[PDB]
Design a protein around this ligand. Structure first.
Ligand SMILES: *[C@H]1O[C@H](CO)[C@H](O)[C@H](O)[C@H]1NC(C)=O
Length: 7
């Protein structure tokens, strides 16, 4: 249910 500084 989250994310991260992807490309
Ligand atoms: C966001 O960065 C995190 C660092 O722990 C992970 O590498 C995660 O897979 C990244 N999200 C995406 C969509 O690449």
């Amino acid at each position: 249910p989250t994310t991260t500084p992807l490309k």
